[PDB]
């Protein structure tokens, strides 16, 4: 019957102590006896008029002290085997302590925990309240007495053993990992019952001495390896030793120290010799040492200032290599050679950084700075010639002469170009040059197709924004709508009430002012032949009917057409410009024409007049009626009666 009754202490405590001794180490005991001892402890804890909670607590504490003292003496007597016996008794005692904490649950929860009511908490007094020899959980008390009577009196002997074995492991020997791990984490397990600083005891007893001894040992190891071995295998063994040390640290210590040891196992053997490393990395990067590059990257990313010196050195190496690559460009293919050389340098070094240096962002930034310096490399007392080269490369890529190359590789080379073009520091010069040669190509119709320049200008807009290609945007649209305007004008010509055969196949290009980089010839006042004034006036009326507040200008240094010799026995197709058409018209008016009638007809200044007359004489178009090798203001000319081509 469950009842508060007078209970004799010794008779119950006999079997209670018997089973407690049975459980304290792992040996057989009945479940029925376990429940009986639960009942016995409940009976002891509450009784009238004599409670026995304090007596039971004190006697259990005394027994635990005696047992742990006996274990300590037995382990001390076990020389040369302190660790193994300690671990065996430790696991036995820890399991037994947990078993007692479970088994004294009433004692813990109803007497010990009710006696921590020191302050005024509705239950002052009425049980042990005075602060004297504080009570604690039976498992907590068991671990506390383990540390006070087994750990501390053995402390110095344990570490010397432990440090001996771990060093033994670091010397290649294979000790029993289970025992070392158990001894090491025993310090944590014992102290586990404190809310604050659970590892504090472990830190003071094993961690700090282990940290110091590892530091000393690896300082000695680093000094040796520096003494007998050069740099490369030095990093090799640094990596090997660091990996093995991390494996060992996981194998033995508490996880919370896993970083610290390696942190103290690299500062003593890497960060203390980065001077040896920084002084040698310069040699490695400027040579084909891939695995070495990876090893220094791994070593220096761990330490604080290891990377930036290597980063700067790699930047310098890449810059020097790029300068060496672009300093010997053959002149006959200088733009394409320059572009492909910069591309090859970029590709090779990005491959190196991604594959070997793990594509670090700082290494990429250093590469970008180096190649930016390389592309804008200007010889002393010279202007940056890169934009002209890039624009010429784009031109040559877009010229008809690109025989045997389809479109797909053209956009491939386009995308390849854009990477280099990003490195240009002054984009405006390239923009002007490319706009000029694009205008030339578009007027002369020297492009693969519309989509080629479409992709060109679109990627340029992607690189440098919309406004960078704004005029570029307008130019191709204006040339595209040129066909629309031409067909609209043809429709208008068919629409007029009376239609006259002009005898000329008329082509027009109406271009936005300002956007197109073509300059008007200042006050050339070239007199258009009468065959074209009708076209001029009809186009003027057409445009000003279809446009509000807009005027038109005509430049005649680029307008071209076809003049054919048909009435004579030499049918030859001639591509002829406005000034040359005026010259041929004048020579057709009269078989002999001197310079005065040339000024009367053309009515433009002498520079282009004389340039055009040499242009005609180059291909033997007209016969100079005089013997003078220079053309003065009195020179005479005639058409070529006997011409062949």
């Amino acid at each position: 019957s469950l009842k508060p009754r007078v209970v004799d202490f010794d008779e119950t405590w006999n079997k209670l102590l018997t089973t407690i001794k049975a459980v304290v180490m792992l040996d057989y005991v009945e479940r029925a006896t376990w429940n009986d001892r639960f009942s016995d402890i409940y009976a002891l804890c509450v009784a009238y008029p004599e409670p026995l909670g304090e007596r039971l607590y004190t006697e259990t504490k005394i027994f635990l002290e005696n047992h742990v003292q006996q274990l300590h003496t037995r382990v001390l007597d076990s020389a040369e085997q302190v660790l193994v016996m300690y671990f065996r008794y430790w696991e036995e005692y820890s399991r037994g302590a947990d078993y007692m904490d479970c088994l004294y649950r009433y004692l813990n929860t109803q007497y010990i925990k009710k006696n921590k009511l020191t302050e005024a908490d509705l239950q002052y007094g009425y049980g042990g309240v005075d602060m004297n020899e504080p009570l604690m959980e039976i498992g907590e008390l068991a671990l506390d007495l383990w540390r006070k009577l087994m750990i501390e009196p053995l402390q110095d002997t344990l570490l010397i053993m432990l440090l001996r074995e771990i060093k033994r492991d670091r010397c290649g020997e294979d000790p029993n990992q289970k025992v070392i791990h158990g001894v090491i984490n025993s310090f944590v397990h014992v102290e586990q019952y404190k809310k604050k600083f659970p590892l504090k005891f472990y830190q003071e007893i094993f961690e700090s001495p282990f940290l110091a001894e590892t530091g000393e040992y690896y300082k000695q190891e680093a000094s040796n390896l520096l003494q007998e071995s050069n740099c490369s295998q030095y990093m090799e063994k640094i990596l090997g030793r660091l990996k093995d040390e991390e494996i060992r640290c996981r194998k033995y210590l508490h996880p919370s120290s896993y970083n610290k040891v390696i942190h103290e196992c690299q500062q003593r053997m890497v960060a203390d010799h980065l001077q040896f490393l920084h002084a040698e990395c310069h040699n490695i990067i400027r040579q084909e040492r891939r695995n070495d590059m990876a090893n220094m990257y791994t070593l220096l990313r761990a330490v604080s200032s290891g990377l930036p010196h290597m980063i700067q050195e790699l930047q310098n190496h890449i810059h020097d290599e790029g300068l060496r690559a672009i300093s010997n460009l053959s002149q006959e293919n200088m733009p394409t050679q320059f572009v492909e050389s910069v591309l090859e340098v970029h590709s090779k070094f990005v491959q190196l950084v991604n594959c070997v240096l793990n594509g670090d962002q700082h290494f990429m930034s250093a590469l970008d700075k180096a190649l930016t310096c390389v592309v804008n490399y200007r010889e002393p007392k010279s202007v940056c010639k890169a934009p002209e080269l890039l624009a010429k490369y784009c031109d040559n890529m877009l010229k008809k002469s690109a025989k045997g190359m389809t479109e797909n590789e053209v956009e491939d080379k386009l995308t390849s170009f854009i990477t280099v073009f990003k490195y240009i520091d002054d984009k405006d010069v390239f923009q002007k040059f490319y706009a000029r040669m694009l205008a030339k190509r578009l007027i002369h119709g020297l492009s693969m197709s519309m989509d080629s320049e479409e992709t060109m200008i679109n990627k340029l807009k992607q690189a440098c924004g919309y406004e960078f290609t704004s005029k570029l945007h307008r130019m191709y649209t204006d040339m595209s709508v040129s066909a629309d305007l031409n067909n609209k004008f043809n429709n208008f010509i068919k629409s007029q009430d009376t239609v006259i055969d002009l005898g000329i196949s008329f082509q027009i290009y109406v271009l936005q002012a300002g956007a197109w980089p073509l300059t008007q010839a200042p006050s050339s006042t070239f007199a258009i032949p009468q065959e074209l004034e009708k076209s001029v006036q009809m186009f003027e009326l057409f445009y000003n009917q279809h446009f509000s507040g807009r005027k038109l200008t005509w430049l005649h240094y680029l307008c071209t057409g076809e003049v054919k010799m048909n009435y004579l026995c030499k049918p030859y197709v001639a591509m002829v410009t406005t000034y040359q058409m005026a010259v041929l018209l004048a020579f057709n008016n009269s078989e002999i024409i001197t310079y005065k009638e040339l000024q009367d007809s053309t009515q433009m200044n002498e520079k282009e007049l004389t340039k055009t007359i040499k242009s005609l004489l180059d291909v033997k178009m007209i016969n100079h009626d005089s013997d003078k090798e220079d053309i003065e203001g009195e020179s005479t000319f005639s058409l070529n009666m006997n011409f062949s081509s």
Binding site: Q507, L511, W516, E531, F547, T553, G561
Partner: peptide
């Protein structure tokens, strides 16, 4: 008798 068969004119348009 000689005559021009083709012409590819170019022009610029701006404010009146």
């Amino acid at each position: 008798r000689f005559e021009v068969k083709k012409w590819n004119a170019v022009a610029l348009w701006a404010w009146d």
